[PDB]
RNA sequence: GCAGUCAAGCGCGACAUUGCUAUACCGAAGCAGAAUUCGGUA
RNA sequence: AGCGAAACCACAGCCAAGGAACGGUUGG
RNA sequence: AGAACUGGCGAUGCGGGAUGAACCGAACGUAGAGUUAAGGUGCCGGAAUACACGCUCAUCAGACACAAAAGGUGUUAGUUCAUCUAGACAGCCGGACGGUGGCCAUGGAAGUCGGAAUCCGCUAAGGAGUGUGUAACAACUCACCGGCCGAAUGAACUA
């Protein structure tokens, strides 16, 4: 289960430079250690700050404001694969940011074969109104009075032998 | 992935459609036509007793192809039942006259002693032209195709030799 | 064997009744046949090279 | 993958035509809405060259309506939207020309049948049909045929026995800002 | 092979390109018939 | 009918893949 | 082929890997209870025909880095542009002109057997012409627009 963390670093302030830029970003990780490692990697890559002169001011966990509210999430993702790195944008209809990022990671590992090692979450934002969604598969669930069945349900059997010839009707 | 895609079929007052498991039956002035679609995996609904919907849920392009072709097949069946279909073929020969006797037998085609026979699956009626009419489009069309395909001019120039029977006109009986 | 006999016969009588429809159907089917050959078939390598050159 | 495998004008031409229509509306003494049916181009060019004081302003119907004014508030000129719902010549002369102008063109007519003209003239005067078009007579024409296939057959034989006349539904006055009913055919 | 133009991309680099050195059954051909040629199954 | 050996003898002759041609675990 | 430095072997059993010298863990007294590594959990084989998200019909798939640069009207996801309620793609109908049959070439070739430029007038739209076709005209036509049509469509690239 993923979790959202906030990490800030200001590169061990020295003489003549008190309170540096104080780089701030949000990191999604399953634990504090992984969040700190990802923050260090992002600082090394995007910025010129390394752990040699770095410092973790504070790490905090951010909880989604409305864990029971359905939202459409627009995520900008930059990931690396066998080919060169390129930007990517996707839209996810989920309830919480953590679930949306988890689904994005699962899709990337499934379709693009990209795993957590080479995936960067640039930004996660909520789409407020309809007709701003640019993906058809997300617009699919926005239709008014959406009703559909669940044909051919895969019923589970607790016994090897069943004297019923079960039907998959729903 | 499409959550639900549906196609509509009209039901004229002169015909009645009874729908059960995928087997489909049509009744009209010209007779009754029935077909089996248990391998197409589509569902039907009675929305207003005058229109028939065929829909597929959670089906992709592969399933959408069958979803759409179901409407075409049902429309073809309805048109055949209401009005029927007519097919015609032309007799062309250079030197050897072609004699056809109704099973349909072709004799004296390009001076060939062998008599080519095409079983009848559809009716035969009559200029030097044949007329084929039947409620089922598939039956009459296949009969015409078989009639055209038996007159193969083997080991001969295609352009120079024109003898044979070919499909010429298509339309409804009405 | 005159200067032009097949052409003269065609002009006098004409082409086959279904020549146009058959040719159009063959042209239409060639599109699917190209894909089938690409996904099928030394011969396959030669076909791929020819397609790339085209 | 697996898809259905001179240059186009574009929106710039539409904007230019809209501006030209606006200029014609605000410049020409009289404005007419020609609801003309299918017309042979010589007819249009003959009408254009008949008088040098008029311009045959045309374009997409929606584009022309927008220039005229699809709404009362969007009208380019007062009461112009009514016309939507280009000649400096005399109005009476223009309407007389519209009501009297007539041109030959390709139904109540009856045609009995081969030759190029279709047998409307003696065999000696007529010429045999070109054998290259023989497949057309069967595949499309299916072949008396008269007492869209009939129109196509008549056009193929070049039987221009019909006639066409320009029709206008309404006329608009530039300065007066009003629409006069002049339904003619 | 040598030497030059290439240039999707990454001074190197794609398709072209310039000087020497058996039987049987199907599809196509200007197949008029026969005969013949090219491709496929085997 | 009777008398009567010797060479040789760790283990031995139904076969399929691969364990330096090494050939002597999954199947038929 | 021959040399210089460096980690295992060699003197070495055990589990895993259909078996295994260059593979992983683990380096060893005889026993009982318990927890694990690599390796595994449909049967042979002791262990879930576990969960969740997507992908693939393969007529010799798949579960093992060279021949791999490219091809496919096979499929699922992304990037850059064009059109877009001034009417998106598509399907039908209509227009698709005048000098003109441009110049040369002419047994006849008028846009389409050939050679060289490609204009004006225009109209919402005509390449002195993208094709079928005739010894030449004839007839259809796409590109170019309009009308009937009603929402997203198209071109090129990446996974």
PDB file of C-alpha atoms (C1' of nucleotides) in Angstrom, chain G residues 9-107:
ATOM      1  C1'   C G   9      38.022 -24.199  -6.858  1.00  0.00           C
ATOM      2  C1'   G G  10      41.223 -27.323  -5.389  1.00  0.00           C
ATOM      3  C1'   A G  11      41.596 -30.788   0.503  1.00  0.00           C
ATOM      4  C1'   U G  12      34.450 -30.127   0.435  1.00  0.00           C
ATOM      5  C1'   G G  13      30.078 -32.509   2.233  1.00  0.00           C
ATOM      6  C1'   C G  14      24.171 -30.104   2.350  1.00  0.00           C
ATOM      7  C1'   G G  15      19.521 -27.644   0.182  1.00  0.00           C
ATOM      8  C1'   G G  16      17.821 -25.378  -4.666  1.00  0.00           C
ATOM      9  C1'   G G  17      18.441 -25.595  -9.950  1.00  0.00           C
ATOM     10  C1'   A G  18      14.486 -32.400 -14.931  1.00  0.00           C
ATOM     11  C1'   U G  19      21.075 -33.952 -13.880  1.00  0.00           C
ATOM     12  C1'   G G  20      25.249 -31.070 -13.686  1.00  0.00           C
ATOM     13  C1'   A G  21      32.626 -27.462 -12.633  1.00  0.00           C
ATOM     14  C1'   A G  22      32.427 -22.454 -13.309  1.00  0.00           C
ATOM     15  C1'   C G  23      24.696 -20.529 -10.983  1.00  0.00           C
ATOM     16  C1'   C G  24      22.247 -18.903  -5.391  1.00  0.00           C
ATOM     17  C1'   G G  25      22.208 -19.964  -0.066  1.00  0.00           C
ATOM     18  C1'   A G  26      24.828 -22.464   3.273  1.00  0.00           C
ATOM     19  C1'   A G  27      30.859 -24.567   4.941  1.00  0.00           C
ATOM     20  C1'   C G  28      29.486 -30.314   8.639  1.00  0.00           C
ATOM     21  C1'   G G  29      29.734 -34.015  16.383  1.00  0.00           C
ATOM     22  C1'   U G  30      25.030 -37.704  17.661  1.00  0.00           C
ATOM     23  C1'   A G  31      19.622 -36.241  18.883  1.00  0.00           C
ATOM     24  C1'   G G  32      14.460 -33.519  20.187  1.00  0.00           C
ATOM     25  C1'   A G  33      11.304 -28.939  19.435  1.00  0.00           C
ATOM     26  C1'   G G  34      10.942 -24.472  16.627  1.00  0.00           C
ATOM     27  C1'   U G  35      12.237 -20.400  12.660  1.00  0.00           C
ATOM     28  C1'   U G  36      14.409 -19.532   7.789  1.00  0.00           C
ATOM     29  C1'   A G  37      17.935 -18.896   2.719  1.00  0.00           C
ATOM     30  C1'   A G  38      18.111 -19.798  -2.044  1.00  0.00           C
ATOM     31  C1'   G G  39      14.343 -22.467  -4.515  1.00  0.00           C
ATOM     32  C1'   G G  40       8.927 -23.192  -4.654  1.00  0.00           C
ATOM     33  C1'   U G  41       3.196 -23.663  -3.935  1.00  0.00           C
ATOM     34  C1'   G G  42      -2.363 -27.638 -10.734  1.00  0.00           C
ATOM     35  C1'   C G  43      -0.282 -33.540 -10.378  1.00  0.00           C
ATOM     36  C1'   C G  44       4.253 -36.174 -10.456  1.00  0.00           C
ATOM     37  C1'   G G  45       6.328 -32.684  -5.523  1.00  0.00           C
ATOM     38  C1'   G G  46       5.909 -31.261   0.730  1.00  0.00           C
ATOM     39  C1'   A G  47       3.099 -25.776  -0.164  1.00  0.00           C
ATOM     40  C1'   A G  48      -2.843 -20.957  -2.299  1.00  0.00           C
ATOM     41  C1'   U G  49      -6.520 -23.974  -9.031  1.00  0.00           C
ATOM     42  C1'   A G  50      -4.571 -16.665  -3.462  1.00  0.00           C
ATOM     43  C1'   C G  51      -5.839 -11.522  -4.118  1.00  0.00           C
ATOM     44  C1'   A G  52      -5.554  -6.732  -7.541  1.00  0.00           C
ATOM     45  C1'   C G  53      -4.410  -4.121 -11.930  1.00  0.00           C
ATOM     46  C1'   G G  54      -3.323  -4.888 -17.764  1.00  0.00           C
ATOM     47  C1'   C G  55      -1.451  -7.448 -21.447  1.00  0.00           C
ATOM     48  C1'   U G  56      -1.223 -12.272 -25.700  1.00  0.00           C
ATOM     49  C1'   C G  57      -4.440 -16.348 -29.787  1.00  0.00           C
ATOM     50  C1'   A G  58       0.581 -17.377 -31.507  1.00  0.00           C
ATOM     51  C1'   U G  59      -0.877 -22.744 -38.110  1.00  0.00           C
ATOM     52  C1'   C G  60       4.557 -25.276 -34.314  1.00  0.00           C
ATOM     53  C1'   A G  61       3.332 -18.523 -28.876  1.00  0.00           C
ATOM     54  C1'   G G  62       4.743 -18.227 -24.132  1.00  0.00           C
ATOM     55  C1'   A G  63       7.125 -20.036 -19.661  1.00  0.00           C
ATOM     56  C1'   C G  64      14.918 -20.996 -22.662  1.00  0.00           C
ATOM     57  C1'   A G  65      21.834 -12.917 -26.449  1.00  0.00           C
ATOM     58  C1'   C G  66      23.841 -13.094 -31.499  1.00  0.00           C
ATOM     59  C1'   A G  67      20.356 -13.893 -36.725  1.00  0.00           C
ATOM     60  C1'   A G  68      16.374  -8.157 -34.548  1.00  0.00           C
ATOM     61  C1'   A G  69      17.294  -3.328 -39.121  1.00  0.00           C
ATOM     62  C1'   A G  70      12.683  -3.301 -40.689  1.00  0.00           C
ATOM     63  C1'   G G  71       7.278  -5.458 -42.200  1.00  0.00           C
ATOM     64  C1'   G G  72       1.767  -6.580 -40.408  1.00  0.00           C
ATOM     65  C1'   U G  73      -6.004  -3.640 -42.535  1.00  0.00           C
ATOM     66  C1'   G G  74      -3.084  -7.905 -35.095  1.00  0.00           C
ATOM     67  C1'   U G  75      -4.054  -5.720 -30.038  1.00  0.00           C
ATOM     68  C1'   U G  76      -3.608  -2.414 -25.547  1.00  0.00           C
ATOM     69  C1'   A G  77      -1.491   2.440 -23.826  1.00  0.00           C
ATOM     70  C1'   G G  78       1.284   7.372 -24.736  1.00  0.00           C
ATOM     71  C1'   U G  79       3.952  12.130 -27.681  1.00  0.00           C
ATOM     72  C1'   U G  80       4.011  16.297 -31.754  1.00  0.00           C
ATOM     73  C1'   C G  81       0.847  18.726 -35.153  1.00  0.00           C
ATOM     74  C1'   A G  82      -3.918  19.687 -38.571  1.00  0.00           C
ATOM     75  C1'   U G  83      -9.483  20.113 -38.808  1.00  0.00           C
ATOM     76  C1'   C G  84     -13.264  21.247 -35.287  1.00  0.00           C
ATOM     77  C1'   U G  85     -21.101  23.716 -33.507  1.00  0.00           C
ATOM     78  C1'   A G  86     -17.690  29.848 -38.986  1.00  0.00           C
ATOM     79  C1'   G G  87     -20.566  22.263 -38.964  1.00  0.00           C
ATOM     80  C1'   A G  88     -15.085  17.158 -37.081  1.00  0.00           C
ATOM     81  C1'   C G  89     -14.033  11.921 -40.564  1.00  0.00           C
ATOM     82  C1'   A G  90     -17.167   9.191 -43.619  1.00  0.00           C
ATOM     83  C1'   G G  91     -21.569   8.066 -47.472  1.00  0.00           C
ATOM     84  C1'   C G  92     -24.641   9.999 -51.629  1.00  0.00           C
ATOM     85  C1'   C G  93     -26.331  14.397 -55.139  1.00  0.00           C
ATOM     86  C1'   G G  94     -24.690  18.822 -57.698  1.00  0.00           C
ATOM     87  C1'   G G  95     -20.985  22.212 -59.763  1.00  0.00           C
ATOM     88  C1'   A G  96     -16.391  20.681 -61.718  1.00  0.00           C
ATOM     89  C1'   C G  97     -16.089  26.963 -66.790  1.00  0.00           C
ATOM     90  C1'   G G  98     -14.096  30.523 -70.481  1.00  0.00           C
ATOM     91  C1'   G G  99      -8.722  32.264 -74.570  1.00  0.00           C
ATOM     92  C1'   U G 100      -8.319  26.661 -75.490  1.00  0.00           C
ATOM     93  C1'   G G 101      -8.440  22.125 -79.402  1.00  0.00           C
ATOM     94  C1'   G G 102      -2.223  27.027 -75.132  1.00  0.00           C
ATOM     95  C1'   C G 103       3.120  26.371 -77.994  1.00  0.00           C
ATOM     96  C1'   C G 104       5.853  22.424 -80.736  1.00  0.00           C
ATOM     97  C1'   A G 105       4.856  17.661 -82.215  1.00  0.00           C
ATOM     98  C1'   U G 106      -0.095  15.830 -86.654  1.00  0.00           C
ATOM     99  C1'   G G 107      -2.034  10.641 -91.161  1.00  0.00           C
TER     100        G G 107
END
